[PDB]
Symmetry: D2
């Protein structure tokens, strides 16, 4: 099975599987039932921004999601990723729709990771920044319904030609190169992730959400994980 | 008076004023009596590295000081700098000697600060990296006994021609430009500081230490702040 | 007696002093009479972007000015800055108006400079990025009519309350810290400058232009340098 | 066949195939016979540094190779990479030995690539920095005799237990993710490469050299490319 650590931007409450009775952001550690959540006042049709950060000194994973001229939603959870994830992982974005839909458009995405080992200035680093996505984005592994090129944007889930969002859709984009998330002999290790999105929903309720995730290198979308599973988990356990 | 927030690498225990009975690292918030300290196994004559980090999401200031092939010392303290420091500050390094001495040589120093406001990718940032210090380092404000140029290093305190450290010395180096440490309308704000040092002590005990500090723009060495005061505080209150 | 090296975005042709008969961009080395120019199809009322780059290996100063979905204007000139400028300089933006006007609005400005000396990874660097300008921008030295805060932008020249541009206006913005542009023992040295602007002109012709400049630390606006002198030169020599 | 653009650090002159009669650095565009070379005073047993740069404004590829307290070797060639290389490529380091040998040790390697298309601050970037190489370096594709982990270094060619170099050896290291080297709608595009090496040769003459290269994504070591072919070319044409 895949080892998943994700920060979810959950637009649809599934109170039956542990979701809060309102849209929220949460920290998922190997389960869709977030170890921590915070109320999120999602704004339909508006471009928002998410920022996720973590460092081995504090061993705390935090995220802030906000819209311009609007209060932000913050969520933090104490977790030592050395004990949860493998040394080498892959990072990506995931999204899904179920009975209800919304567009899960990504306008930009950047990530920076640094590892300092026991030596002078000996820091290994990785950084990538996407502001425009091309039709042939070779450095991205697109899974499921995810597609690039539409207006230079990344469409995680299926959107028809007339621009309307489709139900029962799942899609992910993983950066091509494996990321060395930690090392036993590292003094300091940290990562920063930032992405802007546009969740637009024409129907009754928006669903199901977007999630930033870290996984084992060979991770793939679990079969049937549309809807509430965010394309990350095989079941709601 | 000056508003000081510093991370001290205290090599000499002054138990009479609140120091632990062993070398330690500490977080000083407007007073030399650290709000938080951690035992530090200082290694005489060896190059060490210090890393300090802070972000407005967690509102926690942390630091790690280590030597190669050696366990590190970590210290963290929850503090909202918005309520402590002014919006515009100056960052620097400070060091002192008293009856007992040590060299307070800085081999490198880098700093990165970022402020994200309520707007798309609207991030203001400042970054500087010093690996070599020249005889005429115009972007540094040297105070007291601090001098640059000797072997491309920054000597915070007085070191004789023969290379031996002098007692009763104080010196600081502040980066020339004021730093916008925070702003009421910032979504995220963070800073990272890193510096390598070389503390060498020929005499009985090493004293007194090095400190990374953030202060009011016009800060200056208080008179008589050699020894235990680290060139940062006027008294031991 | 300032030593000036600037890249001009000349919106008004003053053929009487050497300007081409059309808007152009040029490389000015101690004189308003560009050593090199290129036709520039300036677009009234549109946000444009300028990029300047230089490296000691090629000893060539290049710039590209473009507007979205439009052809760019490029200008390059072979010049060894070690022979032209002092070791320590200051960098800034300048703008002026005369009988004719235009707004010289700066929306963003970033600069990065690196110096690699004869040592392993021993690089000294400086980087600052401005996407938003505040009312109290302490790390900037505003000269002449330059002001910050207006909609988070940098207005180099005088703009009325209603927004209309004023004639006979000069203004500059220099970054607070001195920049080590070069060093005799440097293997490689390079710098990159990028800024976006908005030149809007209601009157007959736009005038006079914007310029990115490098100067001696203590440089200041020459008396009477409004109009064709761009706030950089004392005369048309 | 592979499309190769490389900067060679040729330690062994093969005059019979066009090599100058002295160690040299060169720019190879699809052939082992450099379009441009420069005399290089290689220092046996000393750590050196190589810096390569390119930008679409000047369309010139330059490189500087130097040793501390020593004069550098510079080589530049005017070439538009849009006409030579495909849009997506892979970057790496290559080295070889033949009848004569040397160690082709890489101590560090960093790369930065940026593409700015027709849009505000819309820049796509990639940056990776390697100061330490681990035994299980997953983000690198090791070809031939290349190995990592030995003292945290990258040994491009075969070296024994006692550290001595082996003859008739070839090896390469390519970064895992494909690099978008160019795009038809990009205003500016640039890349920078830096790496430190240690060429040590116990035998009569050092051979054959190290090279930084850009190639088609699926490139692999040509059959029989040991010796003078630097593991990049199938023949000496
Ligand atoms: O796209 C949203 C949703 O679609 C699919 O589920 C449809 C409905 O399925 C079950 O009926 C319910 O889970 C329902 O959820 C509502 O009712 C629950 C029980 O009353 C309650 O606990 C929930 O909080 C909610 O009010 C679903 O709407 C499927 O794709 C889901 O995975 C997906 O989340
Ligand atoms: O450079 C070290 C120290 O030098 C100067 O003080 C010298 C001594 O001054 C006082 O005697 C004491 O504070 C002493 O400290 C020792 O004794 C204390 C009392 O027994 C004890 O609490 C301390 O922990 C320590 O054992 C000093 O050594 C002066 O410049 C000081 O500022 C400076 O720290
Ligand atoms: O703001 C533009 C301009 O305003 C001020 O000069 C106004 C006029 O001053 C002089 O008459 C001329 O230089 C004139 O320039 C035009 O005519 C010239 C002669 O025919 C010709 O060489 C020029 O190319 C141009 O067509 C100006 O219009 C003063 O502030 C100037 O510095 C400023 O550039
Ligand atoms: O590692 C060096 C070299 O080893 C292998 O070639 C060995 C020799 O092969 C041929 O004899 C020659 O090319 C010789 O080169 C010398 O002599 C040439 C003719 O006089 C002269 O042009 C050359 O400049 C050189 O002095 C080689 O030494 C094989 O692996 C080669 O690929 C490899 O370069
Ligand atoms: Ca849900
Ligand atoms: Ca003390
Ligand atoms: Ca003019
Ligand atoms: Ca050769
Ligand atoms: Mn949830
Ligand atoms: Mn103390
Ligand atoms: Mn002109
Ligand atoms: Mn050659």
């Amino acid at each position: 099975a895949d080892t998943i650590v994700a920060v979810e931007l959950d637009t649809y409450p599934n109170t039956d599987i542990g979701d809060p009775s309102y849209p929220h952001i949460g920290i998922d550690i190997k389960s869709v039932r977030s170890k921590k959540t915070a109320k999120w006042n999602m704004q339909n049709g508006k471009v928002g921004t998410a920022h996720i950060i973590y460092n081995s000194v504090d061993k705390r994973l935090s995220a802030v999601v906000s819209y311009p001229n609007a209060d932000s939603a913050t969520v933090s959870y104490d977790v030592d990723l050395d004990n949860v994830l493998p040394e080498w992982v892959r990072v990506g974005l995931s999204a899904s729709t179920g009975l209800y839909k919304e567009t899960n458009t990504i306008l930009s995405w950047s990530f920076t990771s640094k590892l300092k080992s026991n030596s002078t200035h000996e820091t290994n680093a990785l950084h990538f920044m996407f502001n425009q996505f091309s039709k042939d984005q070779k450095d991205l592994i697109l899974q499921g319904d995810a597609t690039t090129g539409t207006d230079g944007n990344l469409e995680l889930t299926r959107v028809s030609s007339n621009g309307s969002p489709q139900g029962s859709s799942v899609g992910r984009a993983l950066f091509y190169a494996p990321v060395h998330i930690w090392e036993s002999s590292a003094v300091v290790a940290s990562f920063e992730a930032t992405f802007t999105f546009l969740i637009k929903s024409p129907d009754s309720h928006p669903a199901d959400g977007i999630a930033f995730f870290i996984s084992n290198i060979d991770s793939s979308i679990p079969s049937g994980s549309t809807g509430r599973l965010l394309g990350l988990f095989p079941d709601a356990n």
